[PDB]
Amino acid sequence: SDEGKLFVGGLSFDTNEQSLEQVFSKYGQISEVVVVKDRETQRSRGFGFVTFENIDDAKDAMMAMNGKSVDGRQIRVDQAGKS
Ligand code: NI
Numbered sequence: 001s002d003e004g005k006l007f008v009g010g011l012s013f014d015t016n017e018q019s020l021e022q023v024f025s026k027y028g029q030i031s032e033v034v035v036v037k038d039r040e041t042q043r044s045r046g047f048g049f050v051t052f053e054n055i056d057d058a059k060d061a062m063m064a065m066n067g068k069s070v071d072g073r074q075i076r077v078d079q080a081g082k083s
Contacts, residue, residue: 001080003058003079004031004053004055004057005049005050006024006050006051006061006077006079007047007049007076007078007079007081008020008048008050008065008075009075010047010073010075011044011047011048014044014071015044017033017048020050021033021050023065023070024050026061027052027057027058028053028054028056029053030051031051031052033049033051036048062079066078
C-alpha cells in the first residue's frame with residue numbers, strides 16, 4: 001500500500017539490515033529497513049522491506065537494484081504488495 005516501500009527478495013541467508021541500508025541508501029533517505037525473520041527462531045525468511053521517505057527514490061531504487069547481485073545472490077526488487 002505504501003508506494004515508498006520496496007520488497008527485496010532472494011537474499012542470501014546472512015544478508016542483514018546493515019547490508020540493505022548500505023546498498024539502498026545510495027538512492028535516497030530510508031525510513032525503515034527490515035529483514036523478515038521467523039518470530040520464534042529468528043531465522044531469516046530471505047526477504048525484506050526497504051521504505052524510502054520519498055516515493056520517487058523508491059522507484060529509482062527499484063529500477064536500479066532489481067536483478068543486481070548482493071552477497072552473491074541476484075535479488076528481486078518490487079513495490080511492496082499487500083500483507
Ligand atoms: Ni553472506
